[PDB]
Amino acid sequence: MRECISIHVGQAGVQIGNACWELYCLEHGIQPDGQMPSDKTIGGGDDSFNTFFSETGAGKHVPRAVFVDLEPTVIDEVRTGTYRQLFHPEQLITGKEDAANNYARGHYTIGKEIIDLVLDRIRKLADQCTGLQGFLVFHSFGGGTGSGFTSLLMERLSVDYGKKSKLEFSIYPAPQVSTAVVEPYNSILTTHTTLEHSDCAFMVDNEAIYDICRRNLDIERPTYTNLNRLISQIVSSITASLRFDGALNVDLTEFQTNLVPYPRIHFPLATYAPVISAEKAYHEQLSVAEITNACFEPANQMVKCDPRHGKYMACCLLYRGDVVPKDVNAAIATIKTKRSIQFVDWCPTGFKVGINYQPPTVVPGGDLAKVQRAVCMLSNTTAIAEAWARLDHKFDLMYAKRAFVHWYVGEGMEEGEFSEAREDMAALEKDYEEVGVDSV
């Protein structure tokens, strides 16, 4: 027990789920048919990997996951693909008509038709948990399903499961892979609506990932497949503390205590290293000091922003592989003398560290080098509000002319929901400003 249930919503959520679950299977030695020869307890167990996988009496290790999309073509590829045996068909839920990049349709017109079924299927996963810890909700900000349906689902999950924890992996839109002009609208609407219903959200800026794939991996024009493989590695690093055990392991919840100083200030910045091609990893072993210093290089962040111009409220380092505390501490002491790391005055400055000894895995035929040690930094920095600012600005440009607003009104929404959502975002931006002001 301490089970975690994963909910993958919309195209981006589903396809990132494909990548995470394939990667988890490889990290745990689970086969595409769900068999895990190393698991000697058949049909059950209390092992660390059971937080994410249930077990059938026939030895199948089944993701504690629901996939949901308002059209079927993306989940159809899960149903017929390499890991289709991994999922009971009820875990994969589709309608026939998507949200057409419209929050209104995902939250109201189309989403209301399938929400009760989705909740029923989540319930069946929860009923086989002995100590459910919470949910992990994967979705795009920009799609009509990822925004609207996710928001509806999170509201309904607060009601059905109280203040049981809900963490998000949210895909922040980038023009290089963007599919709709109205993504700023959907982003602000869903951010406003879910803000009370999420305990912790990890934003993944597609432009940050796009740039990393281009600079660090010599991918000329990254695809969703390139982006998702890299995303799944960061996700894997964040969830590793839940799926593995070890003396130096530190639970994600314990990082969460440090990362969230006020309920609304719950958006950690993730930085991941090393992202290196096989070509360049050959004969180059990257030390603890090297991958740690890389965590304070803004080009390695999952969200474009400049923490050197903001203030820190928490710094967490999640190592995996061949890493021991001595080397971490020496690296950290070096960085503290070299780098622009200023904490707000109301917080302690010590970095919080976890180490999982199982080294990173890579999917065959991938772009990333297999390395001996990797690190994900979770920091709570005021600088992440820059991502809100950029997206609020785009919203303001369109909304001043009510560009495209008629598509939302036609599905039942009111202008008041746009202004209320936007005012919440403005308050969020000042919240991030206020927490950075020195005490008196």
Binding site: K96, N102, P175, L397, K401, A403, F404
Partner: protein
């Protein structure tokens, strides 16, 4: 999957309609008997958007052929692929229309519409999930313009939440001398602004000017004009017909292209008109490659869709699309960020290694509507030929109201042209 129901009404609509089905039947590997003999599974992944799968693995266009003139049915069955259409889906009058919109909209067309709706319903109710309708037709004639807009309103009454798309051919004296065509066009536009979600403005003025000045065709035939049309329709439906990420259905395209419900009149373009990616891109944004007789550098882009087809570098396409926007910054409204979206489909059209299709929602489209309005008013100025219309019962103000709505459209296009971000 996401079925589109196709309607072709009148001579122009039926005639470009057959060319459309010929072109995409070839792209999707379907021969005149309805059988598939293609090379890529990617041809069939989304075939059901436009085709029904009848047993014997025969594929049948989800198309409905309409005209008050019975002759055009025969010529449709006569042309290549005439065997493929569903015989029941031929819905014919006998008396024709004589370039009288009122006859198409209120009298002879209204007598025949119910029989068309019966065919629409039958096709619609057999759809797993209907997405909407596309109509091919002219605005200058009497059936396509008048009955076509009547069918739009009647279909909307009963699929009010489905997308209504049109390929509307705009009249030009350079191609047709019929003097009432500005009345018929203006009466049609008065309907399209209220009842369609997205209209491709296929402008005969521009098709003529392309054939004469660029293709160097001294006497362009309707087959010369329609070769440009067929290439355009193939292009602007690539995203509906092949596995794709962007504008993959009619509603998502409308959501990306229509910032205000009335301003849904699109300027299509094509390149090459008969090669490197910088040259494709530059050409497809050139005034000479637009299928609407408008200069984009006389207005500003609210939204744009660009679709590239063929084997090429997505890196280069991305760099060139960024390049053209940055160098032409003034012609893209600053208050709609990232308003240009690009798709790349691997399968080129037939006869080409590489092609680009442009869809512009530009405020320059007012130039077209102003031209129709100039021709309209010159005849309404002197109430010329109105008796043809009041003879069917029409009142003289319906002309006044259609004139007024269309000029309102132009002025709304001007308002957003003049808007600024700050």
């Amino acid at each position: 999957m996401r079925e589109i129901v196709h309607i072709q009404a009148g001579q122009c609509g039926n005639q470009i309609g057959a060319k459309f089905w010929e072109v995409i039947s070839d792209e999707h590997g379907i021969d005149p008997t309805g059988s598939y003999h293609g090379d890529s599974d990617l041809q069939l992944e989304r075939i059901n958007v436009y085709y029904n799968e009848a047993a014997g693995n025969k594929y049948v266009p989800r198309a409905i052929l309409v005209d008050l003139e019975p002759g055009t049915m025969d010529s449709v069955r006569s042309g290549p692929f005439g065997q493929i259409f569903r015989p029941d889906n031929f819905v014919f009058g006998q008396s024709g229309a004589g370039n009288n919109w009122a006859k198409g909209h209120y009298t002879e067309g209204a007598e025949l519409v119910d029989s068309v709706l019966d065919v629409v319903r039958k096709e619609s109710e057999s759809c797993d999930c209907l997405q909407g309708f596309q109509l091919t037709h002219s605005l200058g004639g009497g059936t396509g313009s008048g009955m076509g807009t009547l069918l739009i309103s009647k279909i909307r009454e009963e699929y009010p939440d489905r997308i209504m798309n049109t390929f509307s051919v705009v009249p030009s004296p350079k191609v047709s001398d019929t003097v009432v065509e500005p009345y018929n066009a203006t009466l049609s536009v008065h309907q399209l602004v209220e009842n369609t979600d997205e209209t491709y403005c296929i402008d005969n003025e521009a098709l003529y000017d392309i054939c004469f000045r660029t293709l160097k065709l001294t006497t362009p035939t309707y087959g010369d004009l329609n070769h440009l049309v067929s290439a355009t329709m193939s292009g602007v439906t690539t995203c509906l017909r092949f596995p794709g990420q962007l504008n993959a259905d009619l509603r998502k395209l409308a959501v990306n292209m229509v910032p205000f419900p009335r301003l849904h009149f699109f300027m299509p373009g094509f390149a090459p008109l008969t090669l490197t990616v910088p040259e494709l891109t530059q050409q497809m944004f050139d005034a000479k490659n637009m299928m609407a007789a408008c200069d984009p550098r006389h207005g500003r882009y609210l939204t744009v869709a660009a679709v590239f087809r063929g084997r090429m570098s997505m890196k280069e396409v991305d760099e060139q699309m960024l390049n053209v926007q940055n160098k032409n910054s003034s012609y893209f409204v600053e208050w709609i960020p990232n308003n240009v979206k690009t798709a790349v489909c691997d399968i080129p059209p037939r006869g080409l290694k590489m092609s680009a299709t442009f869809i512009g929602n530009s405020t320059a489209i007012q130039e077209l509507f102003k031209r129709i309005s100039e021709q309209f008013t010159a005849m309404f100025r002197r109430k010329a030929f109105l008796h043809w219309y009041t003879g069917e019962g029409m009142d003289e103000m319906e002309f006044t109201e259609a004139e007024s709505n269309m000029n309102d459209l132009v002025s709304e296009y001007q308002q957003y042209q003049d808007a600024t971000a700050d």
